[PDB]
Amino acid sequence: LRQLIAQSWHTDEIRKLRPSPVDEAKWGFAVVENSLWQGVPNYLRELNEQLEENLGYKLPVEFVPVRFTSWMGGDRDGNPNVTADITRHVLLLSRWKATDLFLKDIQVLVSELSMVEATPELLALVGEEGAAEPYRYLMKNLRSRLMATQAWLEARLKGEELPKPEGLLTQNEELWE
């Protein structure tokens, strides 16, 4: 506690210059990772435990009633600094950050899913090659697919144009499935 307080008294930072839409877009990523990332799923577990306790049923797995959106790098009402270039940029950055957070989730999954008992349907979906570590297989495929798109956006962020990898992620269905 004394360390942490001291940090704040001595860790002084003070913008000298007006923040920019990217900076403000970045603070929202900070809120997303330090609180919403754990917060949403917990909210959904509690809500589900309560439904079943009090009413007798749980919402189906496919039903996620919450969605977060941001106006950062999207709102130009009255703001000349939020240009189409900035939005383009911020749009990319979000994708980069989702890749960052989704990799941490996928790593965990790649190591904890050592189950070998699987369904015809799931086995079919892999059929041989990784049919001796099925769930792990599908998590390893996704891991590469995420790592590929990450690589591509770090280039675009940098200003380089280069074709997009075969497993570029663009839709949620690609992670969901």
Q: How far is the CB of 160 from a second copy (least distance, A)?
A: 9
User: Which residues does the chain break after (C to N > 2.5 Å)?
Assistant: none
Distance CA 52, CA 65 (A): 17
Number of residues that bind a second copy (CB under 8 A): 14
Residue of 1, 13, 16, 63 that binds a second copy (CB under 8 A): 13
Which residue do the tokens 């989704």 mark?
102
Q: Residue 114 interacts with a second copy (CB under 8 A)?
A: yes
**CB-CB contact of 123 with 134 (8 Å):** yes
**Residues within window 16-45 making contact with a second copy, judged by CB under 8 A:** none
Q: How far is the CB of 116 from a second copy (least distance, A)?
A: 8
Candidates 11, 69, 119, 170; binder of a second copy (CB under 8 A) is 11
Q: Which is nearer to a second copy, 9 or 68 (CB)?
A: 9
Rounded CA-CA distance 67/46 in Å is 17
Q: How far is the CB of 117 from a second copy (least distance, A)?
A: 8
Can you tell me which of 51, 91, 115, 157 binds a second copy, judged by CB under 8 A?
115
Alpha carbon of 63 to those of 45, 48, 136: distances in Å? 12, 11, 25
Q: 45: buried, middle or exposed (CB in 10 Å: 19+, 13-18, 0-12)?
A: exposed
Residue reference for tokens 């269905």: 173
12 binds a second copy (CB under 8 A): yes
Applying the rule CB under 8 A, the residues between 39 and 98 that interact with a second copy are: none
C-alpha of 31 from chain center: 13
Stretch that binds a second copy, among 23-31, 35-43, 71-79, 160-168 (CB under 8 A): 160-168
Looking at 7-15, 33-41, 66-74, 123-131, which segment touches a second copy (CB under 8 A)? 7-15
Give me the numbers of helices (H) and strands (E) for the chain, helices first please.
7, 0
Site residues (CB under 8 A) for a second copy? 2-3, 6-7, 10-13, 112, 114-115, 161-163
